[PDB]
Amino acid sequence: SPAGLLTTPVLTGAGSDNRWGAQIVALQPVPSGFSTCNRHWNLNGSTFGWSSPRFSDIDHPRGNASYTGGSTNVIETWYANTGTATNNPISNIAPDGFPDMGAIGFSGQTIPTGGWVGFGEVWNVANGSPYNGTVQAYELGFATGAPNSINPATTTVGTQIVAKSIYGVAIGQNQQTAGLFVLSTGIVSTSGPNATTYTPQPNSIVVAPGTPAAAPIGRNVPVMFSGVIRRAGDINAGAGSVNGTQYGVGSQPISVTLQLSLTNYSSSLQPGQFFVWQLNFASGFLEIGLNVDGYFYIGAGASSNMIELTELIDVRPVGVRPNTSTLVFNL
Amino acid sequence: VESASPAGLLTTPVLTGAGSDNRWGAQIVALQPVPSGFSTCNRHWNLNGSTFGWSSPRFSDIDHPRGNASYTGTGSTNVIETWYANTGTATNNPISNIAPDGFPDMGAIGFSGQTIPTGGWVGFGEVWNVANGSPYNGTVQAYELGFATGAPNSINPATTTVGTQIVAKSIYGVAIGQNQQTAGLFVLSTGIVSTSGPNATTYTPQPNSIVVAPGTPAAAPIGRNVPVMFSGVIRRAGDINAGAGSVNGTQYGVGSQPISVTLQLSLTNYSSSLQPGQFFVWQLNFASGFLEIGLNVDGYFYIGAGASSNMIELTELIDVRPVGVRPNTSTLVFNL
């Protein structure tokens, strides 16, 4: 039974989302629909992405590293084609852990807004030793036009994976072949004190061929799981910051992703159905549904206002329902 | 909330590849017996819903709002950056003010003159401006973090939280150093181990370098039953591409608990299902043998390894089956 996939702890503070690993504190309805494949599992034990259901560091053994000038305090760019992560057993699209987001270019000397940023370095393919003057915060994502005219991409087909430092490195490296190493904990790129929109926005997510979309069904709209994430421009901001709170979203709680990767649920739900749970709040309730592609839905209609989980009391299973029956929204 | 049975704390996935340890977050692939015993408090929970440490059962990031930042050098570029504060000043940590949530329970080893220490906890981060939260973006680097005395100019590792400092010191040069009376620290919470050259070092941390808080109970041997840590492969600074089975040697990191156990113990109180003097015991069934593992009320796991400190690989582990409550003086079966 799918019932055990969503339990009260997952949504009352002990859950984490499958993209940022952030503590899940809100639900984010997406009335346009969206797609996600990386670190996303369906109910047939399968993923269309390139990452395992844990938070792997990011390592690629063969890319091009360069900087744009002298050689100190310079922006370092690493890139490779998609489909070259030949040591990744899930997929060669990209290293396990590489973020499913478009890489955004700079605006003059202004840092891009909304990109996935991790800390990392380039390393020497001769011996595995780091080029230690290349440590920095790097924006990672999919793009065309690397190294020096990057535009974000939303497909894995015929594109590049890029890492570009958002600040200057101590000692730049021009290496026609070099490795990448980045930790898998991400922050979002910003400059100045402001939080940006929830990240990634639907049209920023990168998916691989064959990924099914989560489309709305009447008033039933797909939902993402939201937690507070850090941002580069005010790194001390957190939940309730006077400068605004920054949210990151994932398509699934990682505990759900993990369970779906360990057990096949194809006998318990078929196309056209949801497995439904009731979320009971202090003064209302709503139903959340899971479909066979692993996407969650709520009956929010054309609303993208976040639903805070602060007053959630418990989660109770309801059972299998048609996906065309409106999910109750009684808040 | 109370639970009547610890049985659910250890299940087959925890030890056959879906588990992670509570210090490094690494995939659990082995058991590390510790015949002389050890203590751990950070991100370690007991069966009474409590921790003696300063971290939640979660990995996010390390943030401290008020330390001293400095560098040394004749110039301000490509220099070593040091940040430090006293323990007991992490006032924005709801668990404990000892140290920021996520700060590693390891000693900070001093270094200078283009050598770096072996076996320290290293994380990536920066110092930041307390006026507005903006990074000093030229201070990003890999930093060794730990507890110490003597910062900034005579750093020596400490094993207690009492009267010591928390220190971050970059193992490579930063782009632009900062001498600031007050600066904040921001480091990611998943570490690598400091090394030089290609070699792996011993499993990290060794028992003699774990930092604990006052009141932390020790895991002491009881006859042939000895405490065990959970081992996974971790990165190391000197050969960052090395992973499991590397031709240059495999580097292990250890934690006292699978983080899924820590999390469950933090959510549910088990104090009515196990008492001092008792283990809850599970059987680990391998292709070619089996062993018993026990959990005590302080949250520590034990096996009947006796005087052996050999790692036990979990490659051929088939499943985990609950046995029940037993006296901790009964020898745990070890049939490998």
XYZ file of N, CA and C in Angstrom, chain B residues 10 12 14-17 28-33 228-230 282-293 302-304 310-321 333-336:
138
model
N 16.357 -0.433 13.525
C 17.353 -1.021 12.645
C 16.631 -1.979 11.711
N 16.646 -3.701 7.440
C 17.619 -4.128 6.443
C 18.150 -2.975 5.598
N 18.772 0.093 6.187
C 19.716 0.934 6.912
C 21.144 0.448 6.709
N 21.343 -0.870 6.655
C 22.693 -1.424 6.566
C 23.044 -2.056 5.221
N 22.150 -2.040 4.234
C 22.484 -2.634 2.947
C 22.601 -1.581 1.856
N 22.715 -0.310 2.235
C 23.073 0.719 1.283
C 22.230 1.979 1.343
N 26.462 4.006 4.608
C 27.031 3.014 5.523
C 27.352 1.744 4.739
N 28.625 1.334 4.759
C 29.053 0.109 4.086
C 29.825 -0.829 4.995
N 30.092 -0.447 6.246
C 30.881 -1.299 7.133
C 30.595 -0.953 8.585
N 30.953 -1.886 9.460
C 30.935 -1.684 10.897
C 32.367 -1.578 11.392
N 32.625 -0.623 12.279
C 33.958 -0.439 12.851
C 33.931 -0.714 14.349
N 34.405 -1.878 14.808
C 34.460 -2.121 16.248
C 35.462 -1.205 16.921
N 30.483 -0.144 18.616
C 30.760 -0.152 17.191
C 30.355 1.192 16.605
N 31.088 1.628 15.592
C 30.684 2.775 14.798
C 30.291 2.313 13.401
N 29.613 3.195 12.677
C 29.137 2.918 11.327
C 30.032 3.647 10.357
N 19.583 -7.288 17.446
C 19.163 -7.699 16.119
C 20.168 -8.690 15.583
N 19.706 -9.562 14.706
C 20.607 -10.469 14.023
C 20.882 -9.954 12.625
N 22.161 -9.883 12.262
C 22.591 -9.534 10.916
C 22.970 -10.821 10.188
N 22.213 -11.167 9.154
C 22.408 -12.403 8.406
C 23.159 -12.119 7.114
N 24.365 -12.668 7.012
C 25.228 -12.547 5.849
C 25.150 -13.811 5.012
N 25.689 -13.719 3.797
C 25.716 -14.884 2.919
C 26.407 -16.068 3.582
N 27.393 -15.801 4.440
C 28.293 -16.830 4.933
C 28.461 -16.786 6.452
N 27.550 -16.143 7.168
C 27.611 -16.155 8.620
C 26.534 -15.269 9.208
N 26.705 -14.900 10.477
C 25.806 -13.914 11.058
C 26.454 -13.346 12.308
N 25.961 -12.185 12.719
C 26.386 -11.625 13.989
C 25.204 -10.904 14.611
N 25.300 -10.661 15.910
C 24.280 -9.922 16.633
C 24.795 -8.520 16.935
N 23.912 -7.537 16.837
C 24.242 -6.165 17.206
C 23.251 -5.732 18.285
N 26.609 -2.024 19.859
C 27.639 -2.947 20.314
C 27.632 -4.197 19.442
N 28.796 -4.845 19.331
C 28.883 -6.179 18.753
C 29.831 -7.014 19.601
N 29.784 -8.326 19.395
C 30.640 -9.208 20.181
C 32.001 -9.439 19.558
N 39.091 -5.102 13.537
C 38.944 -5.218 12.089
C 37.578 -4.717 11.641
N 37.567 -3.918 10.579
C 36.325 -3.526 9.931
C 35.543 -4.754 9.478
N 34.225 -4.647 9.542
C 33.316 -5.671 9.045
C 32.579 -5.076 7.856
N 32.915 -5.539 6.654
C 32.211 -5.080 5.464
C 30.774 -5.607 5.440
N 29.844 -4.769 4.973
C 28.435 -5.135 4.878
C 28.037 -5.555 3.464
N 29.018 -5.782 2.584
C 28.738 -6.134 1.191
C 27.831 -7.340 1.076
N 28.076 -8.361 1.885
C 27.334 -9.607 1.779
C 26.244 -9.730 2.835
N 25.810 -8.606 3.416
C 24.699 -8.614 4.358
C 23.391 -8.846 3.620
N 22.617 -9.815 4.085
C 21.352 -10.165 3.457
C 20.182 -9.488 4.151
N 20.058 -9.639 5.469
C 18.965 -8.931 6.113
C 19.209 -8.782 7.608
N 18.387 -7.925 8.206
C 18.425 -7.611 9.623
C 17.111 -8.082 10.222
N 17.194 -8.869 11.305
C 16.018 -9.422 11.963
C 16.049 -9.120 13.459
N 26.581 -12.838 19.764
C 27.166 -13.848 18.886
C 27.881 -13.174 17.730
N 29.063 -13.692 17.402
C 29.875 -13.230 16.274
C 30.318 -14.471 15.493
N 29.610 -14.795 14.412
C 29.843 -16.031 13.658
C 30.119 -15.688 12.195
N 31.233 -15.006 11.975
C 31.754 -14.754 10.642
C 33.118 -15.426 10.550
